[PDB]
Design a protein around this motif. Structure first.
Motif, mmCIF file in Angstrom:
data_model
loop_
_atom_site.group_PDB
_atom_site.id
_atom_site.type_symbol
_atom_site.label_atom_id
_atom_site.label_comp_id
_atom_site.label_asym_id
_atom_site.label_seq_id
_atom_site.Cartn_x
_atom_site.Cartn_y
_atom_site.Cartn_z
ATOM 1 N N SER D 4 -5.036 -0.108 -3.307
ATOM 2 C CA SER D 4 -4.819 1.272 -2.902
ATOM 3 C C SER D 4 -5.698 1.588 -1.704
ATOM 4 O O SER D 4 -6.791 1.035 -1.555
ATOM 5 C CB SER D 4 -5.117 2.250 -4.042
ATOM 6 O OG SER D 4 -5.268 3.571 -3.557
ATOM 7 N N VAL D 5 -5.202 2.479 -0.850
ATOM 8 C CA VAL D 5 -5.970 3.034 0.259
ATOM 9 C C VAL D 5 -5.805 4.548 0.228
ATOM 10 O O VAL D 5 -4.699 5.054 0.010
ATOM 11 C CB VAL D 5 -5.547 2.441 1.620
ATOM 12 C CG1 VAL D 5 -5.649 0.925 1.595
ATOM 13 C CG2 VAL D 5 -4.129 2.837 1.972
ATOM 14 N N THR D 6 -6.908 5.271 0.399
ATOM 15 C CA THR D 6 -6.924 6.724 0.284
ATOM 16 C C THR D 6 -7.490 7.375 1.540
ATOM 17 O O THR D 6 -8.310 8.293 1.472
ATOM 18 C CB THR D 6 -7.714 7.163 -0.947
ATOM 19 O OG1 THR D 6 -8.000 8.564 -0.860
ATOM 20 C CG2 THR D 6 -9.019 6.389 -1.046
ATOM 21 N N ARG D 7 -7.056 6.906 2.704
ATOM 22 C CA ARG D 7 -7.552 7.460 3.954
ATOM 23 C C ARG D 7 -7.106 8.913 4.095
ATOM 24 O O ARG D 7 -5.974 9.254 3.732
ATOM 25 C CB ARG D 7 -7.051 6.637 5.141
ATOM 26 C CG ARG D 7 -7.399 5.162 5.059
ATOM 27 C CD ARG D 7 -8.900 4.952 4.976
ATOM 28 N NE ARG D 7 -9.234 3.635 4.448
ATOM 29 C CZ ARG D 7 -10.082 3.421 3.452
ATOM 30 N NH1 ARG D 7 -10.708 4.418 2.850
ATOM 31 N NH2 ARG D 7 -10.308 2.173 3.049
ATOM 32 N N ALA D 13 -4.780 4.082 8.948
ATOM 33 C CA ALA D 13 -4.848 3.378 7.675
ATOM 34 C C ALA D 13 -4.379 1.943 7.855
ATOM 35 O O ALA D 13 -3.526 1.655 8.696
ATOM 36 C CB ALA D 13 -4.004 4.066 6.599
ATOM 37 N N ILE D 15 -3.030 -1.597 5.796
ATOM 38 C CA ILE D 15 -2.413 -2.131 4.588
ATOM 39 C C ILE D 15 -2.198 -3.624 4.787
ATOM 40 O O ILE D 15 -1.581 -4.039 5.772
ATOM 41 C CB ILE D 15 -1.081 -1.423 4.273
ATOM 42 C CG1 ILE D 15 -1.340 -0.091 3.567
ATOM 43 C CG2 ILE D 15 -0.182 -2.311 3.427
ATOM 44 C CD1 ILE D 15 -0.452 1.030 4.042
ATOM 45 N N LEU D 79 -2.158 9.784 10.148
ATOM 46 C CA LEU D 79 -1.628 10.034 8.817
ATOM 47 C C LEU D 79 -1.413 11.522 8.589
ATOM 48 O O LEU D 79 -2.261 12.349 8.935
ATOM 49 C CB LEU D 79 -2.560 9.483 7.738
ATOM 50 C CG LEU D 79 -2.578 7.970 7.544
ATOM 51 C CD1 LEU D 79 -3.544 7.611 6.432
ATOM 52 C CD2 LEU D 79 -1.187 7.447 7.244
ATOM 53 N N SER D 84 2.643 9.244 2.134
ATOM 54 C CA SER D 84 2.129 8.550 0.966
ATOM 55 C C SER D 84 3.215 7.680 0.340
ATOM 56 O O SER D 84 4.407 7.823 0.626
ATOM 57 C CB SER D 84 1.606 9.552 -0.063
ATOM 58 O OG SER D 84 0.827 10.560 0.556
ATOM 59 N N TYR D 87 3.722 0.651 -0.151
ATOM 60 C CA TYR D 87 4.173 -0.166 0.966
ATOM 61 C C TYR D 87 4.291 -1.614 0.514
ATOM 62 O O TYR D 87 3.342 -2.178 -0.040
ATOM 63 C CB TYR D 87 3.217 -0.053 2.153
ATOM 64 C CG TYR D 87 3.269 1.286 2.851
ATOM 65 C CD1 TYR D 87 2.688 2.409 2.282
ATOM 66 C CD2 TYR D 87 3.902 1.428 4.076
ATOM 67 C CE1 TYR D 87 2.733 3.632 2.912
ATOM 68 C CE2 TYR D 87 3.953 2.649 4.713
ATOM 69 C CZ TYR D 87 3.365 3.746 4.127
ATOM 70 O OH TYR D 87 3.411 4.968 4.755
ATOM 71 N N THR D 110 0.984 -1.887 -1.726
ATOM 72 C CA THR D 110 -0.260 -1.139 -1.615
ATOM 73 C C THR D 110 0.056 0.349 -1.619
ATOM 74 O O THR D 110 0.929 0.802 -0.873
ATOM 75 C CB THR D 110 -1.018 -1.520 -0.343
ATOM 76 O OG1 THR D 110 -1.188 -2.942 -0.295
ATOM 77 C CG2 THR D 110 -2.381 -0.856 -0.317
ATOM 78 N N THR D 111 -0.634 1.099 -2.470
ATOM 79 C CA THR D 111 -0.398 2.530 -2.575
ATOM 80 C C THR D 111 -1.251 3.272 -1.556
ATOM 81 O O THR D 111 -2.472 3.098 -1.511
ATOM 82 C CB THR D 111 -0.712 3.022 -3.987
ATOM 83 O OG1 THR D 111 0.049 2.268 -4.938
ATOM 84 C CG2 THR D 111 -0.368 4.495 -4.128
ATOM 85 N N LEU D 112 -0.608 4.097 -0.736
ATOM 86 C CA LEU D 112 -1.285 4.928 0.250
ATOM 87 C C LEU D 112 -1.229 6.375 -0.214
ATOM 88 O O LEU D 112 -0.140 6.919 -0.432
ATOM 89 C CB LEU D 112 -0.644 4.777 1.630
ATOM 90 C CG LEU D 112 -0.998 5.829 2.684
ATOM 91 C CD1 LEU D 112 -2.470 5.796 3.037
ATOM 92 C CD2 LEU D 112 -0.150 5.635 3.928
#
Ligand SMILES: *[C@@H]1O[C@H](CO)[C@@H](O[C@@H]2O[C@H](CO)[C@@H](O[C@@H]3O[C@H](CO)[C@@H](O)[C@H](O)[C@@H]3O)[C@H](O)[C@H]2NC(C)=O)[C@H](O)[C@H]1NC(C)=O
Ligand SMILES: *[C@@H]1O[C@H](CO)[C@@H](O[C@@H]2O[C@H](CO)[C@@H](O[C@@H]3O[C@H](CO)[C@@H](O)[C@H](O)[C@@H]3O)[C@H](O)[C@H]2NC(C)=O)[C@H](O)[C@H]1NC(C)=O
Ligand SMILES: *[C@@H]1O[C@H](CO)[C@@H](O[C@@H]2O[C@H](CO)[C@@H](O[C@@H]3O[C@H](CO)[C@@H](O)[C@H](O)[C@@H]3O)[C@H](O)[C@H]2NC(C)=O)[C@H](O)[C@H]1NC(C)=O
Ligand SMILES: *[C@@H]1O[C@H](CO)[C@@H](O[C@@H]2O[C@H](CO)[C@@H](O[C@@H]3O[C@H](CO)[C@@H](O)[C@H](O)[C@@H]3O)[C@H](O)[C@H]2NC(C)=O)[C@H](O)[C@H]1NC(C)=O
Lengths: 202, 121, 106, 224, 224, 202, 121, 106
Positions: D4-7, D13, D15, D79, D84, D87, D110-112
């Protein structure tokens, strides 16, 4: 070029086969239809592929019913296990001859599996605490409707019970809480025809 | 055994709507679709319609589109085709067709009806 | 739309002779299907793929050909007024059969 | 598993792609959102370095980077919400002649998640373990250890149990992830028989925004 | 100091920016080659995320990435020869009213070297230390320790000397970097008085393509 | 829009001032000229800025001679130290009012500094060996022309002597070698009027 | 002290090339440039030329370009301007100009010659 | 090219009076320079920047004005047939002076 699956969700027991429909419209003369599986842990697993020209393709427990003129593709799963709780996507694969062709996915169907064995069992209750956190565990119960509760004069918070399937085939449920007192908290779970507290089982 | 039965030959007027029926026995009508083909001595035989009983989706030939409309009934397990303006050289034999169970023979029409002859004045 | 032309309009095959019938296509077609018809009857399924046999036909029948100009061959004639009449392909959305080839036993 | 990425909003961001392909020519990127079908965003070539994006997307937003010989990374320039989702890295399989391009291999995804100015409240799983109850009546006091991950903002979390050895995965049956007013809560419970109750049990939590940036390992001490 | 990247031809390269600016609006990238004047390649905006490149450059080759809030990285998509040289990160200074934009602050500059299929011969500094000669005639045998870095492909290398403490930099006078047939050689020498000869002397070499990827520290043992 | 510096290199002693010329052509009505320094360790240091409109700007040891009509800018360094061995670049700064204006640099000039003190000293030679590697060190010599050599029957390799400036103001030079033998190798350095070997100084 | 000396007034023919000289004393000629200005009662005074002795680069006014060409000699420390087609109302005073040493006064012409008067028939 | 127009063609200033002369510019000019001329002599350096004095002029002279329409002021007149004749700017490549303002002592 357009794909639709109108079934929002389907529920079937372990030993009953299930079918999933996919209705598409395409201007392509020759194409392919792909079926993909999305687990609750997000991951796409390729299940089966049906060519527009070849015969019906069967692989393992998955079979495909193909209607070329009506342009309809159905996936049948026979004697599904407990791991078939994932989402199923039908993708109108553009002619795969090139390496650049995309897949036109659709709003997938959700499959839920109920346990096969149907015996009746009496739940067993327990209460486990850490500091001000209290959790009531009800174990080895078949009846889904329990409405488990806890007794306490002071109510700080409360969380919805979590009910899942034990590997023995039965259901296991857990409750939580952040009650002010620790010693006085006592659980109570209602059987499908009876009710039991935590005073016993001690 | 899989079998398809069709109505007998009918004499028709130059302007009228004619319904041709086809009943399938020996298998489940819902799973498989019914194709309709017209054979004439001059033009040979061409595919003129296709109907899926399960959802009712229909595929027509471009030249035969609009001329023929097909309907299905699962309770009676019978498919009907409607024809209009039959005076325009549309005197021919009409056949039902169904692929082999499980599409074993590809797109080949495994099961055929006996054919209904349509003659117009 | 593919015309599915057939070169032989008529043949005069006799027993003890192996004959070939070609079914040319304007555009390339992946697989090719064949039908046999007899008087006062509907066309039989017969061939279901290139160089295949279906519905229990005599082994004398066979198929061949590349993606264009498929053919069919028979080894010996035995009291069949029509070995194979018609073609069929569904590589194109308009599924067309063809004129048909008739061979009178002589 | 799934990363996961939470930018936050208005920030690039990155991925990564989990595929392991040694002769890939084109690498496609797919986006899946809640209640919507997956849709391809772009595909990056390998023989030549240009990447082609589908219509309807502003140029320059998506970029493809290759830090290593075979390691593709998708970079989103600016972003905003609605960006969201999951990906997926995808690539066509082998077997072109027979079983023609049988599969389009997909990545783990990968969850954004795009938020505003971050949570800033130390969002990281805060365990609270429970002791087994007195249960000598039934199951010879097998007990049920509980790993109660309390407050964490990103949705994804992987809780699994182990003994003092890490060879075999223990079967632990999860609860659910409820949405507390600004965070998410999840809990796991495990029943261990008496024959193995003598072993200390480790609850391993894999989570982004984790202290030290490693898989947390809570330890339940053994009881004879 | 000055870093270096030695990515081979037809492979993306990444160059970092050493500037520390908290309110930068535009970040410019300059290229300096041997025997040629520095020329700007592009400039990336901060308020908006698009970057503008000068005429004569193919679009998509240069990209700007911001892994952190203030950390700009230039990414070259496909590398060919003639793309080698020193890349400088630049940004305009403060003081617009008075001393109007007095300076254009420049970065330390990263050297990009484009080779073909790499050297593959374990190119890394291979020291060969020398012992002080018997010199009690003059300078009370002060001696001259030598750090002889033998075979390394990338040109840049930073050799500096230290005692057992790292507070103060010792004054060591460099030699030169000769070009051996396929590598580069450099050497340093230092004269230490007898009053400090009792200390062990560390020769620190900073170099890319270094084993463990850290500043190598060769140790000369002390002599009374 | 175009900048040129025709001086490839300049050499001056410590106490002598040096000048560097910059001839440019520009269509801009108001502009600025920037002077930058590139050390042997690549780094750009901003030295001075001269506005096209304001007066001559002097900062530290750097002065600028500005000719508006002839469009010429000269930088004068007075009593330069030993650290002024770097390259000097003249950049026709476009009007700096915007944040997007580039700098039009030119082929910079190279400045080399010779030592000021001129006493005469006799070099001292030494030979230091590790394994098969031999290095001859000649220390505390003023005359640049030494032509230091080593005696050995077998010659494997040889490297050009490295001559740099000692902080005392003199020159220090070092030779190397990969000779087959170790014990027999002996150095020899030629003074500006004499010559000395390594047999003495032992 | 800084001083500039100019040639005396010269009577000229309608068509001829005239050379006007200006010698600078008191400073180093190489460092500073010489500007040339023409003052006439009708048009006032305008800048007509600028020459740098060090490199010989010259800047002309667009209207006066081509009409006047300037040359310098460092050994004699003298600047010459050539004039042609002088009959066309070009009867005016000519002044040398030099900025203050170190450009202290900005672009102001600190040092001026006494001026040479040119009258044409 | 900026015309550098000057509003006052002539003045009749007398001792004990403070006067102002304006030198308008078509386009904005950063700094402004002034010159004073006297009969049978070359123009003097005089002002060298906006609101500045140079070459040792009486303190009565002063300058003012924004980026456009600079001016010059004098407090008292004392036997000077021309306080300030001409202007000059070099913000533009064509360096132009102007017509000049003459004020006869009265
Ligand atoms: C109720 O749950 C809390 C939260 O987990 C328990 O506190 C934790 O107790 C464990 C031991 O059971 C501690 O691990 C060890 O603690 C000390 C201090 O660090 C040291 O021996 C080891 O390094 C190891 O960490 C753990 O730190 C501690 N957590 C906190 C946040 O204090 C608590 O024990 C539970 N209560 C009962 C009655 O079981
Ligand atoms: C999420 O955050 C909000 C922030 O407002 C929480 O509101 C909280 O509301 C309660 C009353 O409903 C306030 O008092 C609290 O009540 C109970 C006991 O009666 C207990 O939770 C606390 O001891 C406290 O006394 C509380 O101050 C207030 N929180 C604030 C203002 O920060 C809301 O409950 C939260 N939602 C959740 C946790 O689902
Ligand atoms: C000639 O130069 C070589 C190359 O530097 C010298 O070999 C090096 O000697 C040093 C000690 O003087 C070694 O450091 C120490 O060695 C051992 C083994 O690792 C151990 O005590 C320490 O961990 C430390 O590393 C160094 O390893 C060694 N290098 C190699 C490549 O063998 C050699 O001693 C010099 N000869 C003379 C006569 O001085
Ligand atoms: C760079 O590499 C080339 C590769 O060819 C080197 O060529 C080398 O040439 C020498 C003869 O000149 C070959 O023999 C060597 O000679 C001396 C002693 O006579 C010594 O260096 C070695 O012990 C060896 O016998 C040598 O094999 C050959 N190298 C090869 C074929 O790999 C060339 O000298 C190198 N240039 C340098 C180091 O500047």
């Amino acid at each position: 070029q357009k794909v639709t699956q109108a079934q929002s969700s389907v529920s079937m027991p372990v030993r009953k086969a299930v079918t999933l429909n996919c209705l598409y419209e395409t201007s392509w003369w020759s194409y392919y239809i792909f079926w993909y599986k999305q687990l609750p842990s997000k991951e796409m697993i390729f299940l089966i592929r049906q060519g527009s020209d070849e015969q019906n393709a069967k692989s393992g427990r998955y079979s495909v019913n193909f209607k070329k003129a009506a342009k309809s593709v159905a996936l049948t799963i026979s004697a599904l296990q407990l791991e078939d709780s994932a989402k199923y996507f039908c993708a109108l694969g553009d002619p795969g001859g090139l390496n650049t062709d995309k897949l036109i996915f659709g709003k997938g169907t959700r499959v839920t599996v109920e346990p096969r064995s149907q015996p009746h069992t009496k739940p067993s209750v327990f209460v486990m605490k850490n500091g001000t956190n209290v959790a009531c565990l009800v174990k080895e119960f078949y009846p889904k409707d329990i409405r488990i509760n806890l007794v306490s004069s002071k109510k700080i918070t409360e969380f919805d019970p979590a009910i899942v399937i034990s590997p023995s085939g039965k259901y296991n449920a857990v409750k939580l809480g952040k009650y002010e007192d620790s010693n006085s908290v006592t659980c109570s779970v209602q059987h499908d025809n009876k009710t039991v507290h935590s005073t016993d089982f001690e | 055994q899989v079998q398809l039965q069709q109505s007998g030959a009918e004499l028709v007027r130059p302007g009228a709507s004619v319904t041709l029926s086809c009943k399938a026995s020996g298998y489940t009508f819902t799973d498989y679709e019914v194709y309709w083909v017209k054979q004439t001595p001059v033009h040979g035989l061409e595919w003129i319609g296709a109907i899926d009983p399960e959802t009712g989706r229909t595929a027509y030939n471009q030249k035969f589109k609009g001329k023929a409309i097909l309907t299905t009934d699962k309770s009676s397990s019978t498919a009907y085709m409607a024809l209009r303006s039959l005076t325009s050289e549309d005197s021919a034999v009409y056949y039902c067709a169904r692929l082999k169970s499980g599409r074993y023979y590809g797109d080949l029409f495994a099961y055929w009806g006996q054919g209904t002859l349509v003659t117009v004045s | 739309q593919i015309v599915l032309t057939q070169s032989p309009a008529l043949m005069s095959a006799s027993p003890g002779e192996k004959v070939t019938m070609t079914c040319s296509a304007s555009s390339s077609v992946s697989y090719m299907y064949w039908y046999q018809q007899k008087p006062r009857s509907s066309p039989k399924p017969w061939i279901y793929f290139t160089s295949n046999l279906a519905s229990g036909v005599p082994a004398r029948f066979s198929g061949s050909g590349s993606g264009t100009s498929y053919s069919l061959t028979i080894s010996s004639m035995e009291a069949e007024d029509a070995a194979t009449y018609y073609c069929q392909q569904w590589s194109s959305n308009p599924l067309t059969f063809g004129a048909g080839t008739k061979l009178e036993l002589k | 598993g799934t990363k996961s990425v939470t930018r936050p909003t208005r920030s690039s961001a990155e991925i990564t792609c989990d595929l392991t392909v040694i002769n890939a020519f084109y690498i496609h990127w797919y986006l899946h959102q809640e209640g919507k079908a997956p849709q391809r965003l772009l595909y990056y070539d390998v023989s030549n370095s240009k990447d082609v994006l589908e219509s309807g997307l502003s140029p320059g937003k998506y970029y493809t980077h290759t830090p290593r010989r075979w390691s593709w990374i998708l970079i989103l320039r600016n972003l905003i919400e609605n960006d969201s989702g999951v990906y997926y890295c995808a690539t066509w399989d082998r077997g072109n002649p027979k079983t023609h391009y049988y599969k389009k291999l997909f990545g783990s995804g990968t969850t954004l998640v795009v938020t505003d100015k971050q949570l800033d409240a130390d969002v990281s799983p805060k365990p609270t373990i429970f002791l087994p109850s007195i249960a000598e009546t039934k199951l010879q006091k097998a007990g049920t250890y509980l790993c109660l991950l309390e407050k964490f903002f990103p949705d994804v979390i992987k809780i699994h149990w182990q003994e003092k050895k890490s060879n075999t995965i223990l079967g632990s049956q999860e609860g659910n992830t409820m949405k507390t007013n600004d965070t998410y809560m999840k809990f796991s419970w495990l029943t261990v028989p008496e024959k193995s109750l003598d072993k200390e049990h480790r609850c391993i939590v894999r989570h982004e925004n984790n202290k030290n940036g490693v898989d947390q390992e809570i330890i339940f001490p053994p009881i004879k």
